């Protein structure tokens, strides 16, 4: 940002000068890497068995696609080295807009309570918090938090006014984070080649002593392959330079 | 009295585990004693906590 | 369940090779087992009894 003052009156002073100032930009990256598996297997097998087993073998490697692209944008688990925007985690914790949750009674740092303190850290940064990724045991938990009676302290349901999402593919990283909040506006999701299926039958796979040629072999294999980027708005805004959209509730790690 | 751990409190706790081990709880079996129990348990004032 | 992984790009690099993976099943069977009683009784009490 620009930075103006309080000039005075003088034609010989070093006050009454109108100091000058600089705005600046600055670049963000989608850059497309590929994610992929191959899943070999005897064709005698396929002949076999009582089920499609090439369905059921690309459905879940579709599945276990969609699982990196969870492991890197959120906890940064084998991020590839071109995505040079932090992971979510990451993020939120140097631009130190991690808040400890509090567990036991009804409480400032509660699960609604430290939700509610890291959507104010991420507005007084300047950005608009609309979004909440958690585990299913958030769901589980709010429903139950006591007040200091043993009653339930949040009945109605309290997380109003952000988009809420589950994670159910096991990319969730419990000891790391409780949830994300975040301003949705700022991340973006490159998709460059949605999951993708090639049927091999003719391909060679390792080199050496490794080396499967499927066809001697009377093997087949499905190769799935993506192309994904990840992108996140870390930018000035009218609070100042260097503002992260994101911010993270961590686990209750204290002992009663 | 009614705590984290009470009849509901344990049962929430219980189906959590199951939904994070991504299956989907559905059922509770249990003796005659759980209705009555849970028609019973008090807050810290002695009101019912469980009228619902 | 299978593992995918980010691959990279090249014609030479030990890099750039789409890795291998696998699926898996397992077995469960249900077994017959015999569940029983006999019941003895006098059959002049069966005679006698003002009841089936």
């Given at each position: 940002l620009p930075e103006?003052?309080?000039?005075?009156?003088?034609?010989?002073?070093?006050?009454?000068?109108?100091?000058t100032s600089k705005v600046t930009w600055a670049n963000r990256t989608l850059v497309?890497?590929?994610?992929?598996?191959?899943?070999?297997?005897?064709?005698?097998?396929?002949?076999?068995?009582?089920?499609?087993?090439?369905?059921?073998?690309?459905?879940?490697?579709?599945?276990?696609?969609?699982?990196?692209?969870?492991?890197?944008?959120?906890?940064?688990?084998?991020k590839?080295a071109s995505w040079v925007s932090p992971a979510l985690?990451k993020a939120a914790?140097d631009a130190g807009q991690?808040?400890?949750?509090?567990?036991?009674?009804?409480?400032?740092?509660?699960?609604?309570?430290?939700?509610?303190?890291?959507?104010?850290?991420v507005?007084?940064a300047g950005w608009?918090?609309?979004?909440?990724?958690?585990?299913?045991?958030?769901?589980?938990?709010?429903?139950?938090?006591?007040?200091?009676?043993?009653?339930?302290?949040?009945?109605?349901?309290?997380?109003?006014?952000?988009?809420?999402?589950?994670?159910?593919?096991?990319?969730?990283?419990?000891?790391?984070?409780?949830?994300?909040?975040a301003d949705?506006s700022r991340v973006k999701?490159g998709?460059?080649?949605?999951?993708?299926?090639?049927?091999?039958?003719?391909?060679?796979?390792?080199?050496?002593?490794?080396?499967?040629?499927?066809?001697?072999?009377?093997?087949?294999?499905?190769?799935?392959?993506?192309?994904?980027a990840y992108v996140l708005g870390v930018s000035a805004t009218a609070m100042g330079a260097n503002k992260t959209p994101v911010?993270?509730?961590?686990?209750?790690?204290?002992?009663?």
């Amino acid at each position: 940002l620009p930075e103006a003052d309080w000039v005075g009156e003088s034609a010989t002073d070093p006050e009454g000068v109108i100091k000058t100032s600089k705005v600046t930009w600055a670049n963000r990256t989608l850059v497309a890497e590929e994610v992929a598996v191959i899943i070999p297997v005897p064709e005698a097998v396929i002949d076999d068995a009582t089920v499609e087993l090439l369905t059921e073998v690309a459905e879940q490697g579709g599945q276990a696609i969609g699982k990196k692209l969870d492991q890197a944008v959120m906890f940064g688990i084998d991020k590839p080295a071109s995505w040079v925007s932090p992971a979510l985690l990451k993020a939120a914790t140097d631009a130190g807009q991690a808040i400890a949750h509090v567990s036991g009674v009804a409480n400032e740092y509660d699960l609604v309570g430290a939700s509610n303190k890291v959507a104010e850290q991420v507005a007084l940064a300047g950005w608009a918090p609309d979004t909440l990724l958690s585990s299913l045991a958030l769901r589980y938990q709010v429903a139950n938090v006591r007040d200091a009676d043993g009653n339930l302290a949040f009945r109605d349901g309290s997380f109003l006014g952000f988009n809420t999402h589950f994670n159910r593919n096991g990319a969730w990283s419990p000891e790391s984070a409780v949830a994300f909040i975040a301003d949705s506006s700022r991340v973006k999701i490159g998709v460059r080649q949605d999951i993708t299926v090639k049927f091999l039958d003719q391909a060679t796979l390792g080199t050496g002593d490794n080396q499967i040629n499927l066809a001697e072999r009377d093997m087949v294999a499905l190769r799935l392959k993506a192309r994904f980027a990840y992108v996140l708005g870390v930018s000035a805004t009218a609070m100042g330079a260097n503002k992260t959209p994101v911010g993270v509730v961590t686990p209750d790690v204290t002992p009663p």
